[PDB]
Design a protein around this ligand. Sequence first.
Ligand code: ZN
Lengths: 53, 111, 109, 97, 97, 95, 95, 83, 83
Amino acid sequence: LSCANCQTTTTTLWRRNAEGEPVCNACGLYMKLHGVPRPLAMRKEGIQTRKRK
Amino acid sequence: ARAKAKTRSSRAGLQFPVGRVHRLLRKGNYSERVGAGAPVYLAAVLEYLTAEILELAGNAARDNKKTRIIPRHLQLAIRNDEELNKLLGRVTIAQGGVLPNIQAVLLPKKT
Amino acid sequence: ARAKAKTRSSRAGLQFPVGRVHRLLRKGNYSERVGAGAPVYLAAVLEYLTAEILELAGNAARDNKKTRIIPRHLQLAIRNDEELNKLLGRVTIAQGGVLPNIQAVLLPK
Amino acid sequence: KPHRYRPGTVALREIRRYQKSTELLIRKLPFQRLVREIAQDFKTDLRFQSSAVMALQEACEAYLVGLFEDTNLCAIHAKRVTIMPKDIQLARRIRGE
Amino acid sequence: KPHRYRPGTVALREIRRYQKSTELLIRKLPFQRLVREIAQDFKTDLRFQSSAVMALQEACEAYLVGLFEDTNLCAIHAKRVTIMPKDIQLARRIRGE
Amino acid sequence: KRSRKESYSIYVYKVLKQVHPDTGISSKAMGIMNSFVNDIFERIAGEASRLAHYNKRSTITSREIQTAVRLLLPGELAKHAVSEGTKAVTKYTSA
Amino acid sequence: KRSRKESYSIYVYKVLKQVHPDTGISSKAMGIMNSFVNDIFERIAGEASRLAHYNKRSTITSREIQTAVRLLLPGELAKHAVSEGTKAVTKYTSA
Amino acid sequence: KVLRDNIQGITKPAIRRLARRGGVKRISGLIYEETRGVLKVFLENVIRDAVTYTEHAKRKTVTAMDVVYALKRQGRTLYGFGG
Amino acid sequence: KVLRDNIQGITKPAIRRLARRGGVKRISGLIYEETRGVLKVFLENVIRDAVTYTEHAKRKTVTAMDVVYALKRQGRTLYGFGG
DNA sequence: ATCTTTCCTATTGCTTTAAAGGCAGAGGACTGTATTGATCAGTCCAAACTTCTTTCTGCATGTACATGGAAAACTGGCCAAGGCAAACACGTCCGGAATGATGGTATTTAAGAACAAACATTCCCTGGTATCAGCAAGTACAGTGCCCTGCTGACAGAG
DNA sequence: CTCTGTCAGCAGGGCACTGTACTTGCTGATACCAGGGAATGTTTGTTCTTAAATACCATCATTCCGGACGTGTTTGCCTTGGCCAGTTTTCCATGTACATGCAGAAAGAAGTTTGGACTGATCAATACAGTCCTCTGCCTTTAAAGCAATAGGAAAGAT
Ligand SMILES: [Zn+2]
């Protein structure tokens, strides 16, 4: 699955929007609070920089 | 004139504080004198160990569908790794719990 | 002029060396400074523990009809006393042997 | 007939539940009173930080849990499943306590 | 009939004899050879003081005697008198090794 | 005023971000990591001090720390820690 | 001559003569007793050094040694050693 | 002011839960008194060192550091309390 | 020069004597291999630390003090050879 | 219960080797004075502990039913103890030598100490997202009644 | 008598149904962790000094390797005895579930008390130089312990 708004495959708690499609926790909370979709620029990302055995 | 100051931690490429480690070694009354490379080596070792434990704890937290590491995740990471478990065999972690483990003979039989 | 030197052990009325203990404390990297009474106290404690162990070991040797204390007698003295055994629980005495014990279940009818 | 699980099933369920969780199993106030009583013998009119009592409780729970795993191993060794005072005594004896 | 002690009598005799004495029980030369064999894996051409090998023998026999005491306790706990490998395993597990 | 309390929290968080960019860490876990770092530091420093004292040396150099790490850490942990320590020391000396 | 190596042999022998006038002690027993004295000295000194660093104190005084003795020695030994140390310090202070 | 018989405050279900966390399926009836005695001994041993540390610093309040340190000197190192 | 199989040098009579000192009356046949394995593990653990201590001193002779330090590091303090 | 055999302990003579005592010296303890920095004493305040009060329940206690696990008794066979005889390899010493540990001198490299700048770390304040709580379906698993399928003790009846 | 047909009963095991408990998904509440700004104390740069480690050499001590001889120990084998494992039975002591009330948890407030910051002060430790005498190394002596031989008592096993 993925968020219908910003398309993250991993989230702490899947939710749904008014249309009923799945949305990630941050997007759902942002929509419920402000009435606007969460910007993809506001969405965060990162790449691992260390590894071992 | 004085050159731009550069932290020894950045010089060694570490994230941990070389200066603080050196100061603690000097104030810890461990020896009369401390070599220059001793704090760098110790900081590197500490950074490696904490990176290992954090990696394992993060994997455990991901397994539990949680985003923030908690003491339960640290306990699971430590006790599920043989080397870390041997290193920290005498240590108690607050709110860590225990590994799920039931002796085989205690489980229900079939008949 | 300097007066007649008197060892700090004599002042404290101890057999153990106060000066050597003070020097060991200073050179042991235990503290930046060392109090005057600290070596005296430590020497007194060490002397007391030595006296206790030697008394028990001598009693054990005398019970064994031996004039000189040997490691076996030290082991018998240490393991027959509760406090000393708890203090030296993790210690191994070379050539000390073990206390003679046999579990009562193993004895014959 | 009302439902009734056989002996041992709820025991296994509780084992799984309490091994899955991490909350302190002893009630806080009686343990605090016990700690204060024990400290009363050493020095009168003492005061305790809340974190100090919490640390004492955590250490006691961990120690008892470990002792109970060792006791369970000792009981299983004797071809039993019920822990008995002899099992605890053996576990403490081997550990050097 | 030739004289023969019933089983267990000479066992108790040897127990008393070896608990009374203090001399080393392992033959010195094969233990030295074993020590050298083990040490060669960590560094080639290692010189060994005689006192070092003697100390190793003292420590090893003391550890083994303690382990056998705990093993005998475990054996007696299971209502047996013969020590078995499972008893040593239990003793090591409880001791934390 | 009041005395400031120092800790390793910022450095532990930096290492966590470098390892797991998206995972967070709670305050209790951060305290546990602080305690762990302090414990390992105390162990290694004490062993290095003992090593220096045994050889009648006055300095704790990188060699003492390396030997302490080899003594305390088991197996692969010791090997990887030694590799990281040597890398850090070499990089520091070259700079 | 060889390099001097110090030991507690003569003091242990003097204490033995004080306690058991007509009893001797073998060289192996003297070595064991020397090791015992060194071990107890190390334990008490380490505990006192910790106690001094623990309250941000720079000096190890008689009170630190007394607390170390209280913490380490069990039961009756603790109070007997404390009494002996207090007596020794009282004698020393009066000179 | 005076506390008398609060060792019984370690209730039977509490010991049962502690045993369950240890993987114990069946618990003898006499286990509870033995466990109470063992806990009493352990608490006395730890609190003695904690109170000694408190008395050395001349404080009257037992702080979490003292408990952590008493646990450490007995080989029971505890993480998560400012160690 | 090299040594291959000298773990078998710890003969059955030696293990029997060690058990007898420990108070053991009856010994199972399988005990000897288990005890040999345990002794080998213990010897490797001690000798590794002893050799590390020797190497740190830049020496090539494993002195008794190195063995004493290695034993003390494992909580197995030995009296008689120190010094 | 008494006799025979084995082991253990105790006693006595020789010796040997290890501890007790004596002498030389040096390096480490001791004495005295100046310096200083660590510690002690008094005051204050704030924050953190102790005490008391009310609600509210969850949890401990008490009771009753009954199930299965601990303990005792019996059997046997097989695994280990005891003893004998041959082999071997440990123990003891003696010598060759070669390796490594100790000690001394020139030196050279690296760390302690001091002072100023500034910059990294701590504390304080805010939003916002992960985590907690509650309800409802779905799933997994336990307990149990019924049934089919096997077997076996017993009785009945043809060769 | 042999064997084969017929009854009746108890056992294993499979499967369907009911019921309980745990897991998952969704929504809503909240709390605590990440990010931004003020402050302070601690780290870095630079220079000088000095002392701890390094490199070379000499030398001696002490460990490794080999050899030879004595005999105590190890190892293989045989006999057998008694201890461990399996089976059966019993009963009591634990597990499970239900009902009640009581005190633990949480929140609020007040009291209080004491831990730590701040300032002044005072005194006890360190540094340095000079003196000397106590401890360790070496050597010699003698007595406590070890080894060998003998004798008597205690204990195990058999009749
Ligand atoms: Zn989204």
